[PDB]
Every structure is written in C-alpha cells, then in structure tokens.
Write an enzyme that holds these catalytic residues in place. Structure first.
Site, PDB file in Angstrom:
ATOM      1  N   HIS A  60       0.856  -1.177   0.000  1.00 56.92           N
ATOM      2  CA  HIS A  60       0.000   0.000   0.000  1.00 56.92           C
ATOM      3  C   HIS A  60       0.890   1.224   0.000  1.00 56.92           C
ATOM      4  CE1 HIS A  60       1.093  -0.583   4.192  1.00 56.92           C
ATOM      5  NE2 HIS A  60       1.115   0.769   4.215  1.00 56.92           N
ATOM      6  N   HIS A  96       1.209   5.607   1.155  1.00 56.84           N
ATOM      7  CA  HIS A  96       0.778   6.844   1.794  1.00 56.84           C
ATOM      8  C   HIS A  96       1.139   8.020   0.897  1.00 56.84           C
ATOM      9  CE1 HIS A  96       0.460   4.513   5.671  1.00 56.84           C
ATOM     10  NE2 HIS A  96       1.442   3.825   5.009  1.00 56.84           N
ATOM     11  N   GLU A 112       5.927   9.027   4.974  1.00 54.36           N
ATOM     12  CA  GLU A 112       5.936   8.814   6.432  1.00 54.36           C
ATOM     13  C   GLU A 112       7.361   8.968   6.967  1.00 54.36           C
ATOM     14  OE1 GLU A 112       3.407   5.167   7.122  1.00 54.36           O
ATOM     15  OE2 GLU A 112       2.045   6.869   7.609  1.00 54.36           O
ATOM     16  N   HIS A 134       4.800   0.854   0.846  1.00 51.86           N
ATOM     17  CA  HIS A 134       5.109  -0.089   1.925  1.00 51.86           C
ATOM     18  C   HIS A 134       4.745  -1.475   1.431  1.00 51.86           C
ATOM     19  CE1 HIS A 134       4.802   3.278   5.120  1.00 51.86           C
ATOM     20  NE2 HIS A 134       6.002   3.181   4.553  1.00 51.86           N
ATOM     21  N   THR A 145       2.635   1.905  11.288  1.00 46.89           N
ATOM     22  CA  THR A 145       2.446   3.354  11.317  1.00 46.89           C
ATOM     23  C   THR A 145       0.971   3.702  11.422  1.00 46.89           C
ATOM     24  OG1 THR A 145       2.271   3.717   8.917  1.00 46.89           O
ATOM     25  CG2 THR A 145       4.521   3.763   9.921  1.00 46.89           C
TER      26      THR A 145
HETATM   27  N1  LIG Z   1       2.194   1.507   7.234  1.00 42.06           N
HETATM   28  S1  LIG Z   1       2.524  -0.035   7.706  1.00 42.06           S
HETATM   29  O1  LIG Z   1       3.388  -0.606   6.653  1.00 42.06           O
HETATM   30  O2  LIG Z   1       3.087  -0.008   9.107  1.00 42.06           O
HETATM   31  C1  LIG Z   1       1.196  -1.134   7.701  1.00 42.06           C
HETATM   32  C2  LIG Z   1       1.425  -2.516   8.034  1.00 42.06           C
HETATM   33  F1  LIG Z   1       2.696  -2.863   8.305  1.00 42.06           F
HETATM   34  C3  LIG Z   1       0.447  -3.378   8.097  1.00 42.06           C
HETATM   35  F2  LIG Z   1       0.799  -4.674   8.372  1.00 42.06           F
HETATM   36  C4  LIG Z   1      -0.832  -3.048   7.731  1.00 42.06           C
HETATM   37  S2  LIG Z   1      -2.036  -4.348   7.810  1.00 42.06           S
HETATM   38  O3  LIG Z   1      -3.271  -3.875   7.051  1.00 42.06           O
HETATM   39  O4  LIG Z   1      -1.435  -5.535   7.069  1.00 42.06           O
HETATM   40  C5  LIG Z   1      -2.361  -4.825   9.507  1.00 42.06           C
HETATM   41  C6  LIG Z   1      -2.784  -3.592  10.316  1.00 42.06           C
HETATM   42  O5  LIG Z   1      -4.026  -3.202   9.778  1.00 42.06           O
HETATM   43  C7  LIG Z   1      -1.141  -1.715   7.460  1.00 42.06           C
HETATM   44  N2  LIG Z   1      -2.479  -1.352   7.247  1.00 42.06           N
HETATM   45  C8  LIG Z   1      -2.991  -0.117   6.639  1.00 42.06           C
HETATM   46  C9  LIG Z   1      -2.764  -0.239   5.131  1.00 42.06           C
HETATM   47  C10 LIG Z   1      -3.116   1.072   4.429  1.00 42.06           C
HETATM   48  C11 LIG Z   1      -2.561   2.322   5.140  1.00 42.06           C
HETATM   49  C12 LIG Z   1      -3.713   3.159   5.780  1.00 42.06           C
HETATM   50  C13 LIG Z   1      -4.399   2.560   7.021  1.00 42.06           C
HETATM   51  C14 LIG Z   1      -5.253   1.257   6.749  1.00 42.06           C
HETATM   52  C15 LIG Z   1      -4.495  -0.057   7.089  1.00 42.06           C
HETATM   53  C16 LIG Z   1      -0.093  -0.777   7.461  1.00 42.06           C
HETATM   54  F3  LIG Z   1      -0.392   0.508   7.226  1.00 42.06           F
HETATM   55 ZN   LIG Z   2       2.183   1.977   5.409  1.00 39.75          ZN
END
Ligand SMILES: NS(=O)(=O)c1c(F)c(F)c(S(=O)(=O)CCO)c(NC2CCCCCCC2)c1F
Ligand SMILES: [Zn+2]
Length: 258
Positions: A92, A94, A104, A117, A196
């Site tokens: 994903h 940011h 970030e 990420h 994050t």
């Molecule tokens: N920014 S991050 O790389 O620390 C990260 C993770 F490492 C992570 F494992 C996830 S996850 O979805 O696999 C488990 C926690 O929800 C998200 N999730 C976000 C992905 C999109 C960014 C905006 C927030 C919505 C969940 C996530 F943001």
């Molecule tokens: Zn992220």
C-alpha cells in the site's frame, strides 16, 4: 468516531485508543543520514518476487491495499538485517495533497510525495495475525516516491483506481508484478519500529530504500482522486494519509552503504 487522518481523528488523537502510540519504538521516523551508522555486517537485501501472486485491490477507507496469496513461499524478503524468511502479504501507499508531502519516513527532514510499503510477515510465526504480536514479526520494505518521470510498472495500479473509488470497494488484481515498483539500487537503512497505523504494534523491522522511484504528476494525481468516504456519502478526497515522524528514542538507524 473511529481513527483516521482528519483534524478530529488523525495521528495526534490515536494515543487515546492506542496508548502504544507514545511507545519506545514507534514509526515512522526521520532518517538523519549523517548519524545513521554504516554496518558492514548487514547483508544485501534478498527480494524474491518472481513467483508473486497478486489477487485483489481494496479501498479500505484509509488507503488501498494490493493483496497477495501468502499461503506458500512465493514472494519473500530475506537477507538484509533479517533472520529467516518473510512472506509478502500486501502493499500500500501513503501520499500527500501536494507533491511536497506524503511520505511517512523523512530523510534529513525531507518529505517525499508518497511512500510505498511492502508488508511481509515472518514465516516462523505461521500466520500474519500471530506475527504482529511478535517483536520480529513483520518486515516492511519502504520505498519513497518523487514526482518526475512516470513509473511504467505503477500504471496498472493507477488505471484500476477508478474502479475502487470509495471505501469498501475491491477489484480483481491478478498478475501484477511488484518488481516493477523497485528502484535500481537496494541500498537501505534499517531500524526497529512499529506499524504506522493503529493498532501501532511494535512488531516491524523497517527497511527503507535510499533510492526513491519516480512517478509522474498524472500518476499521483490519480491517487488523490480516491475517496476516504463510502459510496453515497459526501466526498472526502483520500489525501494526506501519512503519520508524521515519531521520536527515535533509544534506537540506532543502520545503513547498508557508505
Ligand atoms: N504503514 S505499515 O506498513 O506499518 C502497515 C502494516 F505494516 C500493516 F501490516 C498493515 S495491515 O493492514 O497488514 C495490519 C494492520 O491493519 C497496514 N495497514 C494499513 C494499510 C493502508 C494504510 C492506511 C491505514 C489502513 C491499514 C499498514 F499501514
Ligand atoms: Zn504503510
């Protein structure tokens, strides 16, 4: 009144639901390139994405996720600072409302337009949900985006965004190759940190590549047309879904180079 990125529910509010927000190993951080130490015992990163199986792309109301089949060792990160094998589960981004913000991590206080990420989990823990409960459960590979020339390997993502404009929309997303999102060099910084986003768990080995990728103004503009809201709700553009740099505290950022 759930968490998000606004004035009323954004990162400065998160500690009230997730006290670990003021913890000892929170992410992201500013990478002060002058004080990061070169560690000649770090290994090259091993990014083995040849067999990756993308499945779906999802607007989750905060960003979008591209999901992978992680039920076998198909797309894995190892080497670098890691012990053992970490499986890619999703990536994903940011990004900002303007080209001068969105990342970030920062580099000597410099913000990039966005940050990719690629999230991987340690196969010693069996599942992702078990891995996030462990101090070495996740490895996230972070890649900065700057605005310049288009990134051709990003265009399949940009082109599907209009099919997932609003929160809870998903679309089939097979045969996408995440190798197309990598820069040329795998030189990196690494430190111990956290998710994050809530629940802000302190389970991440961060590996942040030094070399940004270039994307075009048209590509990032398409990111900024997504919506945080669901269908049939007033439009809230999905922009500025980044957490600011957090105190480094008792941590050292290590460099794989120079
Ligand atoms: N920014 S991050 O790389 O620390 C990260 C993770 F490492 C992570 F494992 C996830 S996850 O979805 O696999 C488990 C926690 O929800 C998200 N999730 C976000 C992905 C999109 C960014 C905006 C927030 C919505 C969940 C996530 F943001
Ligand atoms: Zn992220």
């Amino acid at each position: 009144h759930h968490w998000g990125y606004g004035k009323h529910n954004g990162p400065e509010h998160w500690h009230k639901d997730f006290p670990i927000a003021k913890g000892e190993r929170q992410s992201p951080v500013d990478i002060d390139t002058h004080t990061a130490k070169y560690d000649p015992s770090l290994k090259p990163l091993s990014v083995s994405y040849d067999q990756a199986t993308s499945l779906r792309i999802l607007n989750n109301g905060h960003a979008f996720n591209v999901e992978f089949d992680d039920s076998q060792d198909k797309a894995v990160l190892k080497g670098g600072p890691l012990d053992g094998t970490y499986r890619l589960i999703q990536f994903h981004f940011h990004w900002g409302s303007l080209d001068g913000q969105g990342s970030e991590h920062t580099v000597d206080k410099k913000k990039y337009a966005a940050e990719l990420h690629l999230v991987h989990w340690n196969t010693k823990y069996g599942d992702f949900g078990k891995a996030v409960q462990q101090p070495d459960g996740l490895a996230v590979l972070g890649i900065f985006l700057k605005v310049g020339s288009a990134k051709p390997g990003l265009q399949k993502v940009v082109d599907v965004l209009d099919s997932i404009k609003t929160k809870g929309k998903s679309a089939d997303f097979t045969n996408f190759d995440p190798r197309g999102l990598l820069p040329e060099s795998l030189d990196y910084w690494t430190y111990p940190g956290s998710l994050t986003v809530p629940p802000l768990l302190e389970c991440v080995t961060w590996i942040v590549l030094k070399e940004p990728i270039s994307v075009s103004s048209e590509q990032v503009l398409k990111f900024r047309k997504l919506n945080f809201n669901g269908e049939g709700e007033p439009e809230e553009l999905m922009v500025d879904n980044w957490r600011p740099a957090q105190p480094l505290k008792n941590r050292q950022i290590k460099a794989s180079f120079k």
